[PDB]
Amino acid sequence: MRVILFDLDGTLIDSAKDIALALEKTLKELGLEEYYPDNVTKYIGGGVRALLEKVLKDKFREEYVEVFRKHYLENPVVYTKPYPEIPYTLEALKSKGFKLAVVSNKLEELSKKILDILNLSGYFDLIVGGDTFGEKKPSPTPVLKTLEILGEEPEKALIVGDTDADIEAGKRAGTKTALALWGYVKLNSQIPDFTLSRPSDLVKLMDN
Structure with a gap:
């Protein structure tokens, strides 16, 4: 979906x-x-x-x-703990049939570890990391390879992050981008398609 x-x-x-x-x-x-x-x-x-x-x-x-x-x-x-509402949001998004994935610029072997310790691992259909496959964001191979290994066109994806790199990646990759206002905002010159003030707003955003 x-x-x-x-x-x-x-x-x-x-x-x-x-x-x-x-x-x-x-x-x-x-x-x-x-x-x-x-x-x-x-x-x-x-x-x-x-x-x-x-x-x-x-x-x-x-x-x-x-x-x-x-x-x-x-x-x-x-x-370290998940932000408030994140556990509810992942489970909620997953049960409504959305493929979820963590595309980060932190060691992929570690990305799987910290999440295992926080019990979030299971919601993700894939956990791409800082090294996973050849290039880090800003773009756009981590996002395109991560989307091919999933069966979806960029036009159906949403990057949710806080850096200029995330916005560029999605922009170059063809996805949508949303700023996680609740997180640690590090944007400099980039502008995302949406703004999510709360994780649960994600559940909302993907409603209709």
Whole structure:
């Protein structure tokens, strides 16, 4: 029928606290805690690499990314929970016959893990991740391959996320896009087709 592709962090799950903690740990071990930002939330956005990049700038080193994907995976879920209404919305969307999927830019082996721990895994007909198949958003292969492996044309899909990358992907891929206002909005210059202020509004949006 219709496909709804969701971003993971800042959309389905409120993972800010755990991320900040893993980052605090990594920096302490690496001897760089002085670069821990005053307001960390404006740094959490497109993966572990992009966060360390934004935090360290020229002090960035690739072997740091792996230090982070470590401290953060022995506490992938401590404070993290789905946003309010998300559990109801997935189950609701699934029972009305909608294919659901998580297209994120976070490790695909981990995308399946955090969701297993939060009992959300089962609602998704597929869980594409940061590495899954060859390219990360902004576009448009993760979304087109994810839609072929599902049997739906882009014209029947909806990307629900919070970044300029999500909007570009859907735009380039041919899907619809909606901003998850309840999540952590990181839009800069892009404009989505819709605005969802609450997850349940999704159930509404797909009514008629």
